[PDB]
Amino acid sequence: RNLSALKRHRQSLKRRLRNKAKKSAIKTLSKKAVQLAQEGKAEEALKIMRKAESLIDKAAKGSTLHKNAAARRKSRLMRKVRQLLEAAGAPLIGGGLSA
Amino acid sequence: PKKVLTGVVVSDKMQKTVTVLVERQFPHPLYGKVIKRSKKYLAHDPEEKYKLGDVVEIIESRPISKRKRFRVLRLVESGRMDLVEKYLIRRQNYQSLSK
Amino acid sequence: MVKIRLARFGSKHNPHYRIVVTDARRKRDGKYIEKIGYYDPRKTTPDWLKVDVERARYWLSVGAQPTDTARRLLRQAGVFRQE
Amino acid sequence: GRYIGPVCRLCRREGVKLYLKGERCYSPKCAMERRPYPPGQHGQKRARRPSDYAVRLREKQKLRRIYGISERQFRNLFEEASKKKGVTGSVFLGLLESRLDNVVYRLGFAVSRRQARQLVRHGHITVNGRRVDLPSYRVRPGDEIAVAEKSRNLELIRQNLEAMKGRKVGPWLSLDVEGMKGKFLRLPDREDLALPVNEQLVIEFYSR
RNA sequence: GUUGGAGAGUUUGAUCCUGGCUCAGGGUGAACGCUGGCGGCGUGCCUAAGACAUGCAAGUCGUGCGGGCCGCGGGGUUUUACUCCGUGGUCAGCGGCGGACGGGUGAGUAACGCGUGGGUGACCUACCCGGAAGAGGGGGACAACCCGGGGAAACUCGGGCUAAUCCCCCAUGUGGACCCGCCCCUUGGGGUGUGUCCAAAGGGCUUUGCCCGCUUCCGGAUGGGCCCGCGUCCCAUCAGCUAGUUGGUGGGGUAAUGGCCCACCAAGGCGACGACGGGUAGCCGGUCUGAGAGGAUGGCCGGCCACAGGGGCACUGAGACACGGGCCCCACUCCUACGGGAGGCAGCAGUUAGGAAUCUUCCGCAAUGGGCGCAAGCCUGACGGAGCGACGCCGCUUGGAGGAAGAAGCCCUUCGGGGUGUAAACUCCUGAACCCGGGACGAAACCCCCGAGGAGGGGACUGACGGUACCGGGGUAAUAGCGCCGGCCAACUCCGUGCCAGCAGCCGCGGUAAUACGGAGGGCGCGAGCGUUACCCGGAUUCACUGGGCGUAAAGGGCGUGUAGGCGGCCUGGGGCGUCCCAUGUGAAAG
Ligand code: SF4
Ligand SMILES: [Mg+2]
Ligand SMILES: [Mg+2]
Ligand SMILES: [Mg+2]
Ligand SMILES: [Mg+2]
Ligand SMILES: [Mg+2]
Ligand SMILES: [Mg+2]
Ligand SMILES: [Mg+2]
Ligand SMILES: [Mg+2]
Ligand SMILES: [Mg+2]
Ligand SMILES: [Mg+2]
Ligand SMILES: [Mg+2]
Ligand SMILES: [Mg+2]
Ligand SMILES: [Mg+2]
Ligand SMILES: [Mg+2]
Ligand SMILES: [Mg+2]
Ligand SMILES: [Mg+2]
């Protein structure tokens, strides 16, 4: 009586739930480095982008955070840590920051 | 063709923004007379040196605000306040239709 | 993709197709890009099949794969002859 | 489809000998050469002034009845003449004689267009070797009008084919008796076919 | 071989003028009245975006993966049972691609919605094509299935396994992305340096090869998002509207600019060139009229928009805020075993209600087209076809010739005759319908062979329309109706009627001897149609741009002053805004 191709909903929901995960994982994660970059440290902070960045890209392998939307976060996030760090610190350990 | 337009200002009263008033002159599609039609544009003056009386040029530019999609281009002449009157007086003729 | 399909016209009981290119998701008789020849299967004329064999190789190069009743026509006109 | 009614009334009503019957037409028993006045009771009674709209209707009816045709085709095959370049009044007289049911009459295969149309419609006349059973066939130049060989032996055609033998065919046709084929040469002018029609009136009619 | 313009009746004793009303014309997605034959092509719910029974319209892939199930061949512990290998088909499931195209509607929208021209240094595009470089290892998940439990179905829960083009990590890095500087145009474009980050799938066959896939990157084509100048209905009896409003700083957000969202600042924004509000309405190419200018219309063909009972909502994907996907509130409806469930024809038919009115619950993928697997092939109410309806256009038939100084009946009269009238009957001539025999075009490719899965060539299966069209032969004269007859307006007499019955679009006619009413005879116009009504344009130079007026006909403000606006004497020079000329692009197709 109905379209057996309603299966796409199943595929949709597990895709959705398998999207909210990693996308939100970028959030709280990159919400951790900023405070750390604000509250001072860099070793245990510039180490975080290192993985944060790696995840954004990994989201871009699939249909989650796709496109150059990473290049919206991967650009505006490592845009602040710099300015964050000269506020007591100066760009410290050899992480993702060029010079 | 990014539509260059030339027109007299009307205000210098907002930050980085002015009010170019340009004039269009054309016939009447029904009557052979050649009539005037005018329109007000809002422009982008980041130097804040385009001021009142300045007869300037504007261009179809990238969106800057809601009603601000044109940039200022260059200057033609500054000593033109007698036209601003014709705006200052018209809108003050608008005064006398009330209670 | 983009197709080299046909567009049927003419009176009923007189199919007159236009060897044409639309986008794939387009109606049979819509805003095509390029007509490249007429086609009648009922054989009313001696010149009953024109084909831009040079302009075809445009869209054939830029990526336009056609249908059975479209590939054979380019052969009947000789687009694949080049040797 | 056609008139199918009383014919001699037409000829009396328009005060002109409409040659529609056939052999009786030129005979001394042509109703006009018997009763030359409009029919129906008030014939001999004094006919008052023709209203300025009248005389332009009647000539229009003359031609209409001369060729045996309705008034949609008459109009539609008149619209074309008005649009088609040239003098409006005689292009119209061109696309008329081009009609198949006329030509056969002009070819003397029949003495009457009304007679001719039947022969056309019945599968007897042939154009370029094809069984054309259409009266309203715009005969184009260089066409082969002939009696179908499958029916070129009836007891009607020969009598009326013989009846022509050496008749002065229209100065625009080519008749071959026994060969039974008649080729459409050029195309007519009013000066080539003189009729009692001020065709300009039909214009002035169809402009009111 | 395209070209364009007609007026008339009506006020008065009578005339001229202004002036209005009415008519003849063309068109219809029309209906209705009376008739009614055939075929070709089209077209067919404007009304209630109201409610829908039922059937059908969105699937495809074993050359991706695992499994239940049925046939066929092989089997195993020597063994029942059973279990297994291979091949075909079917059921479903994980997975990939398609359900964002197709098809319907016109509620909404007075808006960058549409049309036109541009911009994008502000972006997107899977399947297509072209070029460069690659696929080395390891881990795992959830359904299908098994067990159990519940419900009438809907369905759902709890436990336990597992494969893969599924998930995840590491390895390399053609190359892409990012922060910070540097080389050139300039809005985020183009390189480069150091640092950081990012890849991968297998399946098959004729395996030392080929087809189909995968991953990163650049480019083309197509298809989109957005911004802008310009034109787009009425009401001035709507004269003020504005607190995200208007600009900015900064952050967010998306593929991208944005006052799209939020925080702080300064008061700014719009309007008589008509802001705000009200009413109507989808827009265009086109269509109808008009000589033109103009006026009205956008059904069906095609382009764009918006909607899928009303409304909001986000997910999935490259793409929707998605008609036949999901969620939630409202209203409606349907189902039952009463605990509870479900549904959305403005998709093809078809029903109901509303109406003056609107199609068969048909056939087939043969064709074109679309989606899937390479491929055979599946699906395709898109479509191609037929079915209904004189709704429109066109074509065609109800016979042709001969035939009476003129049968019959009917009509008129002055009784002598005159009309229907070649009209009828009659002779001949062909033969719509009918009958038989043949029988299509639309249909040559996907497939197979040779050939390299190339080029090229050879071979073969396939039709709903339809035994239709058509063709060959035979063979009967065989439906005609409607309006009008006072002027406009073509077409006349008799009878009855006697301000009654009635006709009538304007004038008007009928008040006894009617060419207007009712009937006949006859005549005029059309003809398988004819008339009525409604609407659009015209006629209406009667909103006057072409193309009008204001002494007495409707019309000069009661006068003055004056802002905005409109308009402006003579001469010279400049810029060339309007203006004019040439080229080029666009102006899609259909019209
Ligand atoms: S010419 Fe013929 S049609 Fe004319 S009236 Fe005489 S017979 Fe009758
Ligand atoms: Mg304006
Ligand atoms: Mg001229
Ligand atoms: Mg831009
Ligand atoms: Mg592009
Ligand atoms: Mg401002
Ligand atoms: Mg509306
Ligand atoms: Mg539906
Ligand atoms: Mg939820
Ligand atoms: Mg098919
Ligand atoms: Mg018909
Ligand atoms: Mg008339
Ligand atoms: Mg009386
Ligand atoms: Mg004027
Ligand atoms: Mg007076
Ligand atoms: Mg006044
Ligand atoms: Mg052009």
**Residue whose C-alpha is closest to residue C34's, from C13, C64, C74:** C64
HEC states along chain B? CCCCEEEECCCCCECCEEEEEEEEEEECCCCCCEEEEEEEEEEECCCCCCCCCCEEEEEECCCCCCCCCEEEEEEEECCCCHHHHHHHHHHHHCCCCCC
What is the CATH number for B17? Answer: 2.40.50.140
Burial label for D75, CB within 10 Å (0-12, 13-18, 19+), is exposed
Whether the CB of D166 is less than 7 Å away from nucleic strand E comes out as: no
Query: What domains are defined for chain A?
Result: 1-99 (1.20.58.110)
Q: Report which secondary-structure segment, H or E, holds D32.
A: helix D31-34
Q: What secondary structure does DSSP assign to D122-143, as a single string?
A: TT-EEETTEE---SS--PPSS-
C-alpha A36/C-alpha A73 separation (Å) is 18
C-alpha D83/C-alpha D85 separation (Å) is 6
DSSP 3-state of D145: strand
Whether the CB of D55 is less than 7 Å away from nucleic strand E comes out as: no
Nearest-10 crossing angle of helices D72-83, D88-97: 130
**Taking the CA of residue A26 as centre, how many other CA atoms within 13 Å lie in the half-sphere pointing to its CB?**
19
Asked whether the beta carbons of A52 and A67 are under 8 A apart, the reply is: no
Which residues are within 8 A (CB) of D112 and not within 5 positions of it... i.e. 6 or more apart? D19, D20, D21, D22, D105
Counting every residue written for chain C, the total comes to 83
Burial B43-60 (b: 16+ CB within 10 A, else e): bbbeeeebebebbbbbbe
C-alpha C42/C-alpha C10 separation (Å) is 12
**Sign of torsion, CA A73 A76 A79 A84?**
negative
**Residue whose C-alpha is closest to residue D129's, from D150, D152, D148:** D148
Cα separation values, D185 from B72, D135, D149, D169, Å? 77, 19, 22, 12
Residue at A80: amino acid letter:
K
Residue at C15: amino acid letter:
P
Domain of residue B14: give its range: 1-99
In this structure, whether the domain defined by D1-96+194-208 belongs to CATH 1.10.1050.10 is answered with yes
Nearest-10 crossing angle of helices C68-77, C53-62: 140
Structure-token match 């599968």, residue found: D123
Which residues are within 8 A (CB) of D155 and not within 5 positions of it... i.e. 6 or more apart? none
Cα separation values, C81 from C53, C63, C66, Å? 10, 19, 17
Q: Report which secondary-structure segment, H or E, holds A18.
A: helix A7-38
Asked whether the beta carbons of D202 and D59 are under 8 A apart, the reply is: yes
Which residues are within 8 A (CB) of A20 and not within 5 positions of it... i.e. 6 or more apart? none
Asked whether the beta carbons of C35 and C29 are under 8 A apart, the reply is: no
**Residue whose C-alpha is closest to residue D98's, from D160, D164, D167, D173:** D173
DSSP 3-state of D30: coil
CATH label, D97-193, candidates 2.40.30.10, 3.40.50.11540, 3.10.290.10, 3.40.50.1000: 3.10.290.10
The dihedral region occupied by C74, where left means phi > 0, alpha psi between -120 and 50, and beta the remainder, is alpha
Residue at D77: amino acid letter:
L
Q: Report which secondary-structure segment, H or E, holds C35.
A: strand C34-39
**Taking the CA of residue A83 as centre, how many other CA atoms within 13 Å lie in the half-sphere pointing to its CB?**
5
C-alpha B45/C-alpha B87 separation (Å) is 21
C-alpha A55/C-alpha A51 separation (Å) is 6
Q: What secondary structure does DSSP assign to D64-106, as a single string?
A: HHHTT--SHHHHHHHHHHHHSSS-HHHHHHHHHHTSHHHHHHH
**Taking the CA of residue D162 as centre, how many other CA atoms within 13 Å lie in the half-sphere pointing to its CB?**
6
Structure-token match 């995960």, residue found: A21
The nucleotides of chain E lying under 7 Å from a protein CB are 1-6, 24, 37, 40-42, 58-60, 92-96, 98-99, 101-103, 117-119, 121-122, 124-130, 155, 167-170, 176-180, 187, 193-200, 216, 219-223, 226-231, 239-240, 245-249, 251-260, 265-273, 294, 301-304, 315-319, 322, 324-326, 367-371, 382-386, 393-406, 411-412, 418-423, 428-432, 441-446, 454-457, 471-473, 477, 480, 487-493, 521-528, 545, 563-567, 577-579, 588
C-alpha A62/C-alpha A15 separation (Å) is 11
Query: What residues flank ligand 1, with Cβ below 6 Å?
Result: D 7-8, 11, 17-21, 24-25, 30-32
Six-digit token string for C3: 């197709």
C-alpha D139/C-alpha D63 separation (Å) is 19
C-alpha D71/C-alpha D3 separation (Å) is 11
Six-digit token string for D109: 């295969």
Cα separation values, B36 from B23, B93, D7, D151, Å? 7, 19, 72, 81
Q: From the CB of residue C13, how many other CB atoms can be counted at a distance below 10 Å?
A: 6
Which residues are within 8 A (CB) of D80 and not within 5 positions of it... i.e. 6 or more apart? D95
Domain covering C1-83 in this structure, CATH number: 3.30.1320.10
Which residues are within 8 A (CB) of D40 and not within 5 positions of it... i.e. 6 or more apart? none
Q: Report which secondary-structure segment, H or E, holds C5.
A: strand C2-9
Q: Report which secondary-structure segment, H or E, holds C76.
A: helix C68-77
Q: Whose CA is nearest to atom 1 of ligand 1?
A: D25
Cα–chain-centroid distance for residue D82?
21
Q: Write down the domain spans for chain D.
A: 1-96+194-208, 97-193
Structure-token match 């005969």, residue found: D139
End-to-end Cα spacing for chain D:
27
Q: How far is the CA of C51 from the centre of ligand 17 (A)?
A: 22
For chain A, the helix, strand and coil percentages under 3-state DSSP, each to the nearest 5: 75, 0, 25
C-alpha D67/C-alpha D74 separation (Å) is 10
**Taking the CA of residue D95 as centre, how many other CA atoms within 13 Å lie in the half-sphere pointing to its CB?**
21
**Residue whose C-alpha is closest to residue D172's, from D137, D198, D141, D132:** D141
Q: How many domains does chain B have?
A: 1
**Residue whose C-alpha is closest to residue A53's, from A70, A39, A67, A68:** A70
- Round to a whole number and report the distance in Å from the CA of D125 to the C1' of E455: 54
C-alpha A82/C-alpha A74 separation (Å) is 13
Asked whether the beta carbons of D108 and D167 are under 8 A apart, the reply is: yes
Nearest-10 crossing angle of helices A70-86, A43-60: 170
For chain C, the helix, strand and coil percentages under 3-state DSSP, each to the nearest 5: 25, 30, 50
Q: Give the dihedral of Cα atoms D77, D83, D89, D95; nearest 10 deg.
A: -40
C-alpha B85/C-alpha B91 separation (Å) is 9
Structure-token match 């009922």, residue found: C42
**Sign of torsion, CA C19 C22 C25 C26?**
negative
Q: Write down the domain spans for chain C.
A: 1-83
